[PDB]
Amino acid sequence: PSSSMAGAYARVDNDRGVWKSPANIGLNYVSKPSVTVSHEEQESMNVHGTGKSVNAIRSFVGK
Amino acid sequence: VYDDWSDSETPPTINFSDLESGLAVIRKEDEPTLLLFPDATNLPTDDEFYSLYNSALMQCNDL
C-alpha cells in the first residue's frame, strides 16, 4: 500500500491541510484489503509496549 | 462437504469441531445480524449441542 498512501497524503494536504491526520480516507482503485483485520485484532497494532505502531487498512460497510 | 454412507443402516455423522470452526470464521464479518446452525440437532450428543449454543450467545455478548 505505500504508493497509494503517498497519493492519499497529497489529497489531504490539498483539501484539508497538512495539519490534519491522513486517515479516514477512501482509496481509489482498490477492490479490498488482502487480509481482514477485526476490531480486536487492531488493539495491538495501535498500542504496544515497544511504541512501534502499525496503521490498518480496513473495509467498512457502505464506505 | 457431505460424506458418504457406510451401509444402508449406517449414515454419515456431524463433526462438532467443524461447526466451531465456522463460528470462529463468521466472527470476523460485520454484516450478519442472526446466527443459525441447520445441522446442530444431528450432533452425536446433547452436550455438544448445548456447548455450541453457549458459544453463540457469548459471541453476541462480546460483539
Next chain:
Amino acid sequence: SYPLSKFHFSVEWGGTKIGFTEVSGLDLETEIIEYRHGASPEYSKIKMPGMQKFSNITLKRGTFKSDNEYFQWYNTINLNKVERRDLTISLLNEEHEPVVTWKVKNAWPLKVQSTDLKGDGNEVAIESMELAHEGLVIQNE
C-alpha cells in the same frame, strides 16, 4: 450586559469549507384558524393554531479556483432522489466556540445561481444557493 454582534459565524454543510459571506431565511411560521358563532356578545372572532411552515435558506460565498461543490451537490438529483444533509449553523464567541445554534433537518438544493459578468465590473464574483428543508430547532443555553 451587552447584545451579540452578527459577523462571526460558521456553517457545516458537508462541504470542504465553512466560510460564507451571507446566511438568511432562518424563520418559523404557524397558520391561524378563526371562529364565531352567531349568538356571541362579541362581534369579532376567536383564534387558534393551525398547520406549520418553514422558509427556504439562502447561502452566499465567493467563487474560488478548483472548488465546484455547489454544482456537485446539485448534480446528485436523479428523478425523485437527492443526497439529503444535516445543516448546522452557528454564531461564535471570542474563543471561536458556539453560542447560538440553528439545527436544520433533511436539506437539499432547489437552485444554484451563478455570477453575472461585466466589462467594468470591479468586484468579487459571488455564487449562491437556495435550500429546502424539513425543520428547524434553535439552541441557546
Next chain:
Amino acid sequence: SYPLSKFHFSVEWGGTKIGFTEVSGLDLETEIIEYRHGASPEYSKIKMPGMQKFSNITLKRGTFKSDNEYFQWYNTINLNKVERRDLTISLLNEEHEPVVTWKVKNAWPLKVQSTDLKGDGNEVAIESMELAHEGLVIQNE
C-alpha cells in the same frame, strides 16, 4: 487564498468577435413536490424534487460599423426552423486561459433589441440579444 474577479471573460457563439460588455442569466432551477398523510405526528409536509427549468441568457455589446451579426443569426428563423448553436462562456486567468466554463446546449435567439436615440445622448450605442437553450453544465477543475 483569494477569490476570482468578474471582469475578464470571453464568449464563443459562432460570430466573428468574442468580446462582450455584459453576460447574465446562468441559472439552474428545480421544482418541489410536497406531501402529508393525515395520521402523521408532524403538522408540516415532506418534500422531494420535481421537474427542471433553465433561464434565458442575455448578451450585451457595443454597435460597430459593418457588423450585422445579431440580425443575421435572428434572420435564420423560418417557420419552425432556426440555426442552433453551442455556446461556450469562460472566465479567464492572467495568461488569458479558462478557469471556469459554462457550457450551453442548443441555443437560438428569442429577441434582438436595438438602441434608443437621443439629441443629448452623450454615450455608446449598445445592442442586446436574448437566448433560449436546452441545458447548462458548469466546469471548474
Next chain:
Amino acid sequence: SYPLSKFHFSVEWGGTKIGFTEVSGLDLETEIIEYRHGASPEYSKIKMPGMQKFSNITLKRGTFKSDNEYFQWYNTINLNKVERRDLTISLLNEEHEPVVTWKVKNAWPLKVQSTDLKGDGNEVAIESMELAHEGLVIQNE
C-alpha cells in the same frame, strides 16, 4: 425531432380564396356491439365494431367587401339538389408545401351564420359555415 405547429394551413373548397381563420371537426367514429352468454366464467361482455359515423366540419373567415361566396354556395340548394364539392385541407411546411392532408368527399352546407353587431364592438366581423360530408381519408407520408 420536433412536432408540427398548428397555424400555417390552407383550404381548397371551390371558392376564390383559400385563407381561413379557423377549421374544426376532422373526426372519425365507430359504434360498439356487446355480447355475453350465460355460461361464461367472466362477468363482463365481449366487444366488436359496429357501423361508422363522421362529424360535421366548421369553417370560419373574416367578412370582406364584394365577397358573397358562403351565401352563393348555400343558395344552390333546390328541394333535394345541391352542388356537392371535394374539400381538401392541408397543413403546410416552410416552403408552403403540404405535409398532412385531410381529404373530404361529397360536402355541402347545412348552415351559414352571420355576424352580430355592437355599438362598442371594436373587432372584426367573422362569418362561419357548417358542412355535411360522406367520408374522410388522412394522408401523412
Next chain:
Amino acid sequence: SYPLSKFHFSVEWGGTKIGFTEVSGLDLETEIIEYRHGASPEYSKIKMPGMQKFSNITLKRGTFKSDNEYFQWYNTINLNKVERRDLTISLLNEEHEPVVTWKVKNAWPLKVQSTDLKGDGNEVAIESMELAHEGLVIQNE
C-alpha cells in the same frame, strides 16, 4: 418514505414509438344488487356484488412528419374484424425500469380525433385516440 411522481412513463402498443403526452381511464367498476324482506328489523337494504365494467382508455401524442400510425391501426377495421392488441402501460424509476404496470387485454380503437387549426394558434398540434378493451390487471411488486 416518499410517494411516486406521475411524469415518467412509457406505453407499448405495437407502434414505432412509446412516448405519449397523456394517458387516462385506467378504472375498474362493479355493480350492486340490493335486497330487503318485509320482516326485517332494519329499514335499509343488504348489498352484494353484481356484474363488472371497464372504462375506455385515452391516449394523446404530438403530430410528427411521416408518422400515420393512429390512422393505419384504425383503418384495419373491416365489417366486424379488427386487429386486436395487447397494451402495456408502465410507470418508471430512475433507471428507466418498470415500477407499476397496467396490463390491458384485447384493445382496438373506437375513435381517432385530429387537431383544430387556428390563424393565431401558437401551439403544438396534438392528436388523440380512444380504445376499447376486455380487461385490466394491476401489478405492483
Next chain:
Amino acid sequence: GTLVWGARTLAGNDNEWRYISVRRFFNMAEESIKKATEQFVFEPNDGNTWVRVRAMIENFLILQWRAGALAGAKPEHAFYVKVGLGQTMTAQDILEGNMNVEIGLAVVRPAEFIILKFSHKMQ
C-alpha cells in the same frame, strides 16, 4: 393455520429486556447511530465537534419518532441526548482524547392478555 404464539427472550423475567422487539429495536438503533458517528473519529475534541455530533444524533431520533417507533406526544418526551465538559466529560477525558455522549429512549411494550366478561343484561 400454523401461527407463532409468543415473543419473549431467554430472560423472560427481565423488566427491561424480556421482549424480543425491545432488544431488537435497540440493536438496530445502536448500529445505525455508530455508522453515522464514524465520520467524526479524527476530528478535534472541542465544542464545535460536540455540537455537530449532538445535532446529527437528534435528527436520527426525530425521524424514528415521526415513524412511530418511540413513545411520546412530542420528541421532547421520546428521547434525550447529552454531551459536554462538566456534563459527560472531565478534564482527564479531554487529555486522553475521549468523548462521552449519553442517550435515552422511550420504548413501547405490547399487551399479552385480553379478558372478556359476560352477564345477563337487566334494568
Next chain:
Amino acid sequence: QWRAGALAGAKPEHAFYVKVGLGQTMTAQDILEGNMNVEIGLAVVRPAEFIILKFSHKMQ
C-alpha cells in the same frame, strides 16, 4: 498560519512566540564568531481517537 487555522489560540499571542537578542539568545562570544540565535515556539492541535456512546431507558 494562525489565521488559516493551523495553530491553536484565540489570538496570535497565544499561538506562538519568536525571540532574538544579545542577552536573550546570544552572548558576546556568538557575536565574535558570527553566530545568530533565534528561538521559536508553537501551539499545535492534536486529534481525538475515541468516541463512547451510552444508552439507557428514559424515565421520569
